[PDB]
Design a protein that fits this description.
The structure is cut from a larger assembly and holds three copies of chain A and one copy of chain D (50 residues). By secondary structure, chain A is α+β, with helices and mostly antiparallel strands. Chain A has one helix at residues 6-12; one strand at residues 15-19. Chain A is 19% helix and 14% strand. Chain D is largely without helices or strands. The chains are: A alpha+beta (37), D little secondary structure (50). The PDB classes it as immune system.
């Protein structure tokens, strides 16, 4: 959980969003994620 | 920028899945409807699925649409469809995202 | 104070779940989407809980 | 409209050309689309984050 940013919080949660609230996650592209839990 | 919305969706739509798409809007106080739809990309020509959701004070302006991209409706053939438009439309806003 | 998330953990959660929490606050004239999430570790409880045993022992 | 424009020092039309009513709208007020990835100026204009 957690995240660097609101868009990063959504992206790491495995979500995406539409908003007009001055955020988008199209900047949030990343390598495949291999953290272990 | 008082009147704002969030539509939250799975990062990726699984074909044949039912994707529960939830919309929240803030600062509205009059009830209004929105439709959330999945439309073919880039042409927006074919509506694979659409959901009509009522946003109002007893909803607390929060609702969700159960949208499903039925697999045989995608064109298929030599190229798989890699993208689709999630779109919302209301009295107050419209946005679509690939 | 704000209400807790009191919802019961459901059988559709049993492998794992993720809680995300968000609000938009629009102070001044500018909105910020504010959000957090946590990993939720849920018991591997089977839905049907099939169990098999031999009658003699 | 001004049916007949005042000419040669004829008295101009007096009062407002417009009047306004309170009314129940059929339309929603279109929202701002926020700046997304771009930096948002306090006015609400958007500029490159660079």
């Amino acid at each position: 959980g957690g995240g660097l940013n609101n868009a990063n919080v959504f992206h790491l949660a495995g979500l995406t969003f539409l908003t007009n609230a001055n955020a988008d996650d199209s900047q949030e592209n990343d390598e495949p994620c291999k953290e272990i839990l | 920028q008082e009147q704002t919305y969030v539509i939250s969706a799975p990062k990726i739509f699984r074909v044949g899945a039912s994707e529960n798409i939830v919309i929240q809007v803030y600062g509205y106080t009059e009830a209004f409807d929105a439709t959330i739809s999945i439309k073919s990309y880039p042409d927006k020509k074919f509506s694979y699925s659409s959901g009509h959701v009522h946003l109002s004070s007893e909803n607390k302006f929060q609702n969700s649409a159960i949208l499903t991209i039925q697999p045989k409706q995608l064109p298929g053939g030599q190229n798989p469809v890699s993208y689709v438009y999630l779109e919302v439309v209301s009295k107050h806003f419209s946005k679509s995202k690939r | 104070s704000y209400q807790s998330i009191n919802i019961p953990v459901t059988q559709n959660m049993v492998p794992s779940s993720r809680l995300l929490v968000y609000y938009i606050v629009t102070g001044e004239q500018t909105a910020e989407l504010v959000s957090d999430s946590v990993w939720l570790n849920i018991e591997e409880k089977c839905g049907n809980q099939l169990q098999v045993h031999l009658s003699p022992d | 409209s001004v049916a007949v424009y005042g000419q040669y020092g004829g008295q101009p039309c007096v009062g407002n050309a417009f009047e306004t009513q309170s009314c129940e709208p059929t339309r929603g007020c279109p929202t701002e689309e926020g700046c997304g990835e771009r930096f948002r100026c306090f006015s609400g204009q958007c500029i490159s984050k660079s």
